[PDB]
Symmetry: C5
Subunit: 311 residues, 5 copies
């Protein structure tokens, strides 16, 4: 079986529709998500268009290997989707109404700049390769493009599941292709980050700043160096779930700043001590007293500047 | 082969039954569990209803590709279930008695608020999509809805395996669907948490409070900072098996409180020292003496308030 | 094809035999092991019992889809086994001699109480569901129940592979089932635990007890607190390969005891210091001197009591 | 169906073309990458060359199991590729135009010497084994050798996807083979390494050098030893994503140098202290003062020498 | 189709040959390696031996499901191999020349005693089960037993790929089996271990020995205890890629020795301090001075003794 012939020279319009059933396993590091949905396909095939006079049926149900079915694929997938045909039903005009339930691992990249406050647009690209006798173009039937209310993506708020109605028609290996953009907008649930990651990581850094109210080099060494060890240990605990990005992250910049703040604090502790031992207690005291206001104020402004630059 | 026709306009009732054989691999982070069970299906098909007069058989056993079998699927699954048909037997009225043994990775969310004292309700959603000629509705045969006595879910106490008898009939992509709720109630085995996690994590925090019986800033710095490092290391050891939740956890709140308690203790140690060095030993001593009662009492009340709020 | 009819009312006896080829991947945390073995089945089917007079064959070899074969399954499996039929051969009396090579992930629970000195009994449950016309019962042919000499389970000593000859006949979903218990006895290789885990973990705890020969609170704080950090780090290094058990482990109890011993040592160090500073050096010295004998003696007896209770 | 016969003695030329659709999962440790692409094959088969006079078709579309198709395989693959035939179309001269969409895990080694500034050349080896009647040779159709604009390999910059036009014809197990080299040039995105790995790891090492401005052995011991612990912890945090190489890495050498620099600093701290205690403060002071310039200058030159040797 | 009959009573000799294409993923912990190779099989079947007079062919090429092919399996595999038949060609005498390309996960145990200087012998066991009419025996065609020059096993040097020519004929479940031993000799690339693991781990231990040139108990406590923490952290960093062995490893013994050396050093530090405080400075000094020579000399000899015992 090959494709239905045109009346004139018109291409075959395959009306599409993706309905999300289950959506899960969003791997931040791999920039992949797993989706279990319904794929809806519709096209007219006059060859199987029959008369409600003679035909012993009103709606003719077929098996997938009895009629011509368009080779519809996904662009951004790891391997081909695990699809199970649900129903194929031909209306007397020849209109085929295909439906399958598929599960696929979609490969859509993410923007980690505004992390962990970020929002993403996940993409599902439907494609059809035009054939010898008839050229095939994709379309969006917005009545069969949706999502189940129960759909849950852990740590994210599902905003919308839509499709860019106009297909991307282009040439690929001497044949026309029709690509459709199914967009899934999601926004990260950042509550947990504040009391679980941000606040304990700020407390450890604040502990080091107590060395600006001490003259004991032994106590100061223990303070700044031990908190630096606590910091690294905390970051080990709090995992690492992001890939290596070519760009700079909001969180990326803050972390670097914190490592710089540990280094500067050591320099201060060292400077204060050297002046004190080299009989210059006024300079040693003035530097320590200044640092008490300097370190928090600089930290505050630097975070404000960064926040502004990223948001 | 398509569905049996009605006598009037009545829908086809498919009686269902899930019998748990093996239940395992409950992934807290992924909110998934693996299940190996029996799926029982029963429906009347008059087309294959024959006479115990003529028929050379008493009970007619068939192969799955000889008779019409309803397309029964699971809603909350990763990929389609790995099922192996056990037996199909037609009674001479046409009553089909289908049975298969399946294994599926079910995707049912969890509530981590009362963790590690929590209890869950796992869901297994059976679905049937109604077809062109005949509409299909699901039913519960409570005589074939159960669980094997040996069924073990490591770290959980299996309470019950039941089914919500009334199906959820609704419209989806221009056709009727019939959904059934199979509920698996489980309650976490929290013994281990008390001597393995809770008690050692409380001991490390209690060690820091010994700085309220010392005047040695060097000893106090080592006490509060080193125990903070021990705390983080202990938490690294004791793993992290929960996802990022939009809500706040009982354990989540207590942990944050402990990080705050390390910070407050540092402030005290720093305050006591600054007053002592700035020739105010009475204030330095009164603050330390108060902290001896303050820190445990505040901790006790805060834990009581939290416990009350979560339970 | 359905089952052979009885001469009278006798059930069909299917003689079984499992022969272990490869045995591996014993996951302590998941309580699963992977097995690659031979499954041997034998039953009489008079329908295919032919005469050595006429028959142009002496031993008739068949294809699995030419003759009736009993639906034999495993109870405690994740998914159904990957089996490849090796040989089916019918003797003139009708005796079928079936043989397949299968690989399955078996789900058998473990008792971690006596860990790492423990011994386990792994279970492989063979099952057959009786059918409409003929009831089916399982049997053990002990001549085809064995294991390959080379079979290796890393870190365990394979003691025996046997079968409980009497099957467990019971009712399940209105039909009889015949269950067979194939037991695989294994005993843990505990050598490594003594010099790699037990001894280094005891050395770190012994280091803390040197604070009973010091009067330097700074040295004592560093001793007890730093060794506690070393302890946790060591346990992080030495992994965590056991699940969360409802019961208490021999190793579980010892670990808790060690955390208690770190806490008590801190109390001592704190007590000795407070008395010394509050001008009571005799009490401070008597407590320290006592602890020198107290801490090791109590530890020794407590370990003896626990060892006795678990073994 | 076997191969088309030659007109004379000429071998069958199979024109090839790989078009990258999705490229991902580059495992540095495993030296593997996953690829989803189009495989294009073209050859003349006069047996199916038909006349545009009689033939009721203009372009004859076939099924893969209707015509002879060359056995094309990949050399450096884990398992055989998951390919799905897209289109087979015969032109009247007999020219077959085959196209499939495949996904394979390619096994191409990497050079970690210049890491993390490295560049790689990934290889995809196409092979065809010549047969009894006709010998088969591979060719490159550069019009169907490309990559999708969207193709993204996280942490790498895709430079080019080309093919070495001249095939590698050789003998293997008494038959000719024709191998084609598809090269994928990639260059690592090293930005992240500077502020996330290099700079914090340099700060910790610089902290240790402050012991050259102190005379307190207690402070110096804490400085050099604690920073060494911070260093190791940081490296644990920053993962380990490279295999065990027979050669020496740029990063490999620098790391070893840093461990040597921690050791030398300890020796200095120990030397300075021993001279000071053995009443030689001039030697103790001269060594410390020298080290202030020595340690950074030596480090700078050593890094310059290494950088030169590797780049 | 069943096996070719004998002329007399002779068994069927199946000539074998494994040619390594890709060899990779050697999992030390799992004692498994993945192999992609060519399997060559040859046997005479007179039934298909045809006359170069009548036969319209010179070399008859067949499809696998047209002729009898021996059921050849691998003993030490996880699951059955993923094989794709490359070519089957019958010579006029009846000699069949079979060839397939397979990928399998081989399960061959390892000896970790001499690790990381160890050498292994990997095993690939070919087996054939004799059948009813004809008994089957295996043979080695050494002209088709080899390896591709490009074959790379990361971190290992491939020494040789050979086969034990004499097969292991034995009885298994009432039938004869013929087993062939394909041996793959490999030797570990130990360069990396010296500057990356051995040397940094020796430096940390040498740092602790500086406490033999100090009288400061506070400095000594920090030295020996902090280096012990650095040691454990280093070992965490440097991974753990070996299983739990019943025997003792060369590396295993050295590690235990290092933990003992940390313990003994603490004892010394404690002893020196107690004598010094109990007004015995001569004994305290003699012990410290001795330890300066004792600790390195004992370490040197112990390593020499161990090295001798393992190599
Ligand atoms: Cl697809
Ligand atoms: Cl399903
Ligand atoms: Cl099974
Ligand atoms: Cl391939
Ligand atoms: Cl195999």
């Amino acid at each position: 079986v090959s494709p239905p012939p045109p009346i004139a020279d018109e291409p075959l319009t395959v009306n599409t529709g993706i309905y999300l059933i289950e959506c899960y396993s969003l791997d931040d590091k791999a920039e992949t998500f797993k989706v279990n949905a319904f794929l809806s396909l519709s096209w007219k095939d006059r060859r199987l268009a029959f008369d409600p006079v003679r035909s012993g049926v009103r709606v003719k149900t077929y098996e997938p290997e009895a009629i011509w079915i368009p080779e519809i694929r996904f662009v951004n997938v790891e391997n081909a989707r695990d699809a199970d045909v649900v129903d194929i039903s031909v209306s007397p005009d020849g209109t085929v109404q295909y439906l399958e339930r598929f599960s696929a691992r979609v490969l859509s990249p993410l923007d980690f700049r505004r992390y962990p406050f970020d929002s993403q647009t996940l993409h599902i690209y439907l494609i059809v390769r035009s054939v010898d006798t008839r050229n095939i173009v994709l379309a969006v039937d917005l009545e069969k493009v949706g999502k189940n209310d129960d759909v849950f993506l852990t740590g994210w708020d599902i905003e919308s599941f839509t499709a860019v109605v106009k297909p991307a028609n282009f040439a690929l290996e001497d044949r026309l292709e029709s690509k459709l953009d199914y967009q899934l907008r999601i926004s990260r649930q950042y509550f947990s980050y504040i009391p679980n990651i941000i606040l304990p990581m700020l407390f450890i850094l604040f502990i080091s700043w107590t060395a600006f109210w001490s003259t004991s080099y032994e106590a100061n060494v223990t303070l700044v160096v031990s908190t630096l060890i606590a910091h690294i240990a905390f970051n080990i605990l709090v995992g690492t779930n992001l890939p290596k990005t070519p760009y700079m992250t909001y969180t990326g910049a803050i972390i670097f700043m914190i490592y710089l703040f540990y280094f500067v604090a050591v320099i201060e502790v060292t400077v204060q001590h050297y002046l004190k031992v080299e009989s210059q207690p006024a300079r040693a005291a003035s530097i320590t007293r200044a640092s008490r206001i300097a370190f928090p104020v600089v930290f505050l402004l630097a975070n404000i500047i960064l926040a502004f630059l990223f948001f």
